[model samples]
Target: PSRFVGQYTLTSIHQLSSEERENFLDAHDPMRVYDLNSETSVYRTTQREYVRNGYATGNPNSGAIIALHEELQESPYAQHIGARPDQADAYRPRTAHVSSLNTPSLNVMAGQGALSALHVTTEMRLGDFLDQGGKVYSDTSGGDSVEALIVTLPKGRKVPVNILD
Candidate 1:
């Protein structure tokens, strides 16, 4: 038997904070987005990344977003970002790399992973998830990380599992 490790799960788009929300979805703006936890600005997802990054601007299907920083930093918008008139063409967002997804995925360097990126689940038994007694609780290693999880049996019985285990 193979050894079992943990699995990755889902975090809904609605669950992300207001500011982080835009960065997670179809957002590929010219301005830089900040990330305090990572001490870096390029540490988030954007629509362009879903097409694959380190991509050529000449690519048709996915090229449009790759030049965003340069496109926006030109002429008028560059001035908006405070670039000198002469330096307009040289302006760059606080974070460069026009399109990127920064998950440090194990396969960005090779394969079809980036092209197929984006979270979507099937209608089947798409792995396991906790049921609510329809009430909620801790995950497993509960609080202190602890809380109670209430599970309602299909027959209408409720079990309040102590999450502090």
Candidate 2:
């Protein structure tokens, strides 16, 4: 059974290094994983963490589609997402987590970081896909569960992708 479903292209923004990752005893912890580096706005709550694409300061092209579990301080790119206490001056653009995507473009930044994991079911579309010839590496040394990122692409679309089954 799938816990979530949506039509959007996906990318893992910032990947925590070996020393930066916290314990996975429970994902509910405030800072379980992910370390967004001010690429987009972020907000948090007991049930869900919301993120929006926009930046108050930085390259105008910079936008955050994904963010970390922990909140950042004294940063304009760290504005809260949902309705609550926040500054009206913040330029956080309105966005939805499960909303339909208009584009599949995503930024991978740097030569290091993990690609979003893939599901076994994507094999059916293997023939129609393309990739940047980038290699993917995975380390299961730590007892943590890796999730397969569900990427929704249009038929016959050409994109670089990874495979892990």
Candidate 3:
């Protein structure tokens, strides 16, 4: 049985080395691994220790989606998903473990104190939707300020299209 139903797109962002990486750079070597000229000595040491321990301790075969989810558990992007705490809690069951074929978009804003180019490929009408006709009826005693953000389309910009499966 499929854990999830519906079409999903998976996106992953990785930092690319602009120039060729130095030769004889062992990922396990402490001196070679640690950036001694880092902004902070504490950060340098902690990074070194983390890499050392990660290498010393064998890694498990957690899937890419699982790994990505773990990395994003506390990220700002994750924080934006649910508007309220209760809503957030409700979202956990389905999202706690990501399926192999349906990895959500993973974006790493910063990496190793280096600036990298970012390319975002967004789909037309991309969002989470449930099959149903829901109604939103607001009965407010007009009193407070109504705030909204509206986007104005440009004259030359054509609305993109997509095919439903």
For each candidate, what is the lDDT?
A: 0.22, 0.22, 0.20
Could you tell me every candidate's TM-score relative to the true structure?
A: 0.17, 0.20, 0.14
Residues 1-165 of candidate 1 have per-residue lDDT tens digits of 111111111223343344443543323221222111111111112233332332211111221112222222223244334433232222322222312421111101111231223122111110111132121111111113112111112222222211111
lDDT of 3 at 101: 26
Reference-based lDDT, residue 156, model 2: 30
Least lDDT summed over 10 consecutive residues: which range in candidate 3?
A: 126-135
Show where candidate 1 strays beyond 4 Å. 1-32, 36-64, 68-73, 77-83, 86-165
Arrange candidates, best TM-score first.
Answer: 2, 1, 3
Question: Residue 71 deviation, candidate 1, in Å?
Answer: 8.6
- State the displacement of the C-alpha of residue 2, model 3, in Å, after optimal TM-score superposition: 40
The whole-model C-alpha lDDT of candidate 2 against the native structure comes to 0.22
Query: What is residue 40's positional error in candidate 3, in angstroms?
Result: 40
Better of 1 and 3 by TM-score: 1
